[PDB]
Nucleic acid binder design. Structure first.
Ligand SMILES: [Cl-]
Ligand code: NA
Ligand code: NA
Ligand code: NA
Ligand code: NA
Lengths: 216, 459
DNA sequence: GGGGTTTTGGGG
DNA sequence: GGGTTTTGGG
DNA sequence: GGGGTTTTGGGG
């Protein structure tokens, strides 16, 4: 059961190892959405949540071409229609990118969007950050839990159980708690990163560069 | 400073007026524009607290207080209903039929909060003691003065506040909406329910499990910093919440930056009756154990009642600061929460081994009872919110040779190679423990650098 | 007028 | 004042 | 001096 186009899409993507080709086909249709903000952060909504669309250097050039009298950074409170887009998973620093969770992000790559200037949209609930939603956050936690469980079951073996003598008859025995620390995977750093999905890769423009390109 | 009672305050003077009052409701201080913050609250006193009772239906009467400021920190954070607030230089005026007091803290107005109970909410969370009964636990500006002629006023209103909350609901039925009717609301509404569970979703967020008088269960996200006073078993009033139509797995309430979660003072009759009438619900949990993937968290265990008053310690502190933190070093028994990633030994049949108490050795029972007394030797690999991102998994032991955690599975140790019944119950419990969204609430005893589970059983 | 401040008599 | 920021506790 | 406020120039 579902009403939030953005929530359903992002949820299926995550529940499909980031494989956008495996997500429902009856959902890859044009997306008519309201523009909540345009700077310093461009944020659109589907009537329930707001997400950050990422424009390719192509999409912006096409837009400017077919719409010279229109500035993207000034699309606030205006409605747009993304006719060509895709979804991909990226590893980010959730401490910096608020449109993500658990150092993971589902990006909406926009290839082509038309501005339906002066179109009034139906009154809806106040838009909230999708990555702050309870269910979606949980959906992402399920994702990591799955990746972690697989890695751990592959890394931890041999049933290296603490010898019973170390816990029983330990009156004159002292130990450090870090002895209970066990690596979860062959990860390079101090952060878990042993995932199976292939991180999407697509050059995208920073909202600041488009600001200078329209009023440098 | 002359203090006037709410019902006697002048409506025509338009001059600065001061007063003492009881707070029964309040929004959280919220920002409106690039320079202003607001805090709206409901106040009452011996002269204004209940509507003309005969047809009123015991509905509470009250005046409103709107404090304006240029900084977030210049406004009061109301965590509990029943406490007292003192306002200086407030101008009163009628707003839509009711007495609305307004005060610009950014100019010359000031406020001060006094605890009705022995300790303020914050002082309870930190286990502190109030300076005195005439000392404000919070106030605007750098200074707050209390003259001798005030003590009688403060002490009196405090006595009244307790007589009021103990005799009336204070938060009447017309002030909140039944949870099972939440979906019928056009916009935001208020709630009055008991907290059945505080689930630590992540580093900065708690997920509250609520259930009100209507018997309906709801979940909502509550930031740790914003509402650090949330506690299981306690009844709270949630000011401003919306029904989430985009959640289909579970009933979710959406809160806003101006939303507020408030507890009640000890004498609260409403809170007292609700803490008793409303009973824990596990219907959600039970139904989840049937789904391959539950978007609802399930706490499978329960610690012994004697530990219910014991605070919890994260895995981060347990494994990374237990040998370097002065406080954590003085304790051997801790409480904590986590989810099981993996269980060892892999073969559930080896969970129970024969134990020789003379050699301090244990062995497999695949070669029959010749190994000694039967015991549980299980090593859980866990993880939690405080360690969610790191590349570590931590070992939590369930070694019952000495009696610690012998009843964790509700299954007495036995040769699992021969007792099919005991083996089946454990295998089932194993699937639940490693299943996503399954967590453990348990007490552990530190022994030779390891943590052994004790005083903890299943659900 | 009155705060805190210093401006210590006077802007907008 | 029964409301909507960015600090994206606010 | 500068806010808010109204005192709309001047107290302590
Ligand atoms: Cl030790
Ligand atoms: Na001066
Ligand atoms: Na002055
Ligand atoms: Na002045
Ligand atoms: Na003036």
């Amino acid at each position: 059961q579902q009403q939030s186009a953005f929530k359903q899409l992002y949820t299926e993507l995550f529940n499909n190892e980031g494989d956008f080709s495996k997500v429902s086909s009856n959902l890859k249709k044009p997306l008519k959405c309201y523009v909540k903000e345009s700077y310093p952060h461009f944020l659109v909504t589907d009537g329930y949540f707001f997400v950050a669309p990422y424009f390719t250097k192509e999409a912006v050039n096409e837009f400017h071409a077919k719409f010279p009298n229109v500035n993207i950074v000034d699309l606030t409170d205006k409605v747009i229609v993304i006719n060509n887009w895709s979804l991909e998973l990226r590893r980010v620093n959730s401490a910096e990118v608020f449109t993500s969770y658990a150092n993971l992000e589902a990006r909406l790559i926009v290839h082509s969007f038309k501005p339906n200037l002066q179109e009034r949209l139906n009154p809806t609930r106040y838009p909230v950050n999708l990555f702050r939603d309870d269910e979606f956050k949980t959906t992402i936690q399920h994702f990591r839990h799955t990746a972690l469980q697989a890695a751990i079951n592959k890394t931890v073996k041999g049933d290296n159980l603490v010898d019973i003598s170390k816990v029983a008859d330990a009156a004159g025995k002292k130990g450090k708690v870090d002895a209970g620390i066990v690596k979860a995977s062959a990860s390079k750093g101090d952060e878990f990163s042993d995932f199976s999905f292939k991180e999407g890769n697509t050059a995208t423009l920073k909202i600041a560069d488009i600001f200078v390109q329209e009023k440098g | 400073y002359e203090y006037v009672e709410l019902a006697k305050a002048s409506l025509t003077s338009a001059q600065p007026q001061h007063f003492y009052a009881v707070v029964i409701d309040a929004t959280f201080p919220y920002k409106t524009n690039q320079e202003r913050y607001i805090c709206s609250l409901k106040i009452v006193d011996p002269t204004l607290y209940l509507k003309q009772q005969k047809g009123a239906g015991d509905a509470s009467d009250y005046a409103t207080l709107v404090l304006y400021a240029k900084r977030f920190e210049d406004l009061p954070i109301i965590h509990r209903a029943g406490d007292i607030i003192r306002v200086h230089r407030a101008t009163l005026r009628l707003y839509n039929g009711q007495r609305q007091f307004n005060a610009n803290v950014f100019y010359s107005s000031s406020w001060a909060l006094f605890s009705t109970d022995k300790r303020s909410v914050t002082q309870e969370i930190n286990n502190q003691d109030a300076v005195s009964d005439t000392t404000p636990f919070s106030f605007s500006s750098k200074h707050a003065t209390i003259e001798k002629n005030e003590i009688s006023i403060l002490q009196n209103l405090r006595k009244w506040a307790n007589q009021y909350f103990s005799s009336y609901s204070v938060i009447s039925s017309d002030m909140y909406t039944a949870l099972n009717k939440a979906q019928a609301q056009k916009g935001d509404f208020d709630v009055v329910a008991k907290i059945l569970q505080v689930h630590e979703l992540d580093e900065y967020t708690n997920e509250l499990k609520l259930k009100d008088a209507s018997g309906q269960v709801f979940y909502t996200l509550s930031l740790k910093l914003k509402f650090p006073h949330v506690r299981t078993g306690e009844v709270v009033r949630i000011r401003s919440a919306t029904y989430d139509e985009t959640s289909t797995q579970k009933k979710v309430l959406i809160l806003s930056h101006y939303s507020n979660i408030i507890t009640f003072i000890q004498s609260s009759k409403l809170a007292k009756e609700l803490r008793a009438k409303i009973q824990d619900d596990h219907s959600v949990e039970v139904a989840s154990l049937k789904k391959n993937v539950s978007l609802n968290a399930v706490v499978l265990t329960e610690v012994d009642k004697k530990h219910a008053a014991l605070p919890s310690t994260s895995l981060q502190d347990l494994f990374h600061h237990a040998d370097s933190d002065k406080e954590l070093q003085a304790q051997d028994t801790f409480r904590t929460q986590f989810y099981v990633t993996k269980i060892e030994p892999s073969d559930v049949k080896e969970w129970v081994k024969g134990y020789d108490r003379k050699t301090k050795k244990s062995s497999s029972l695949k070669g029959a009872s010749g190994k000694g007394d039967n015991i549980f030797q299980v090593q859980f690999l866990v993880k939690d919110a405080s360690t969610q991102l790191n590349n570590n998994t931590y070992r939590v032991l369930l070694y019952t040779q000495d009696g610690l955690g012998a009843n964790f599975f509700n299954v007495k140790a036995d040769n699992l190679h021969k007792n099919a019944d005991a083996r089946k119950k454990l295998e089932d419990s194993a699937e639940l423990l490693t299943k996503f969204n399954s967590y453990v609430d348990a007490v552990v005893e530190r022994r030779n650098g390891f943590y052994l589970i004790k005083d903890t059983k299943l659900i």
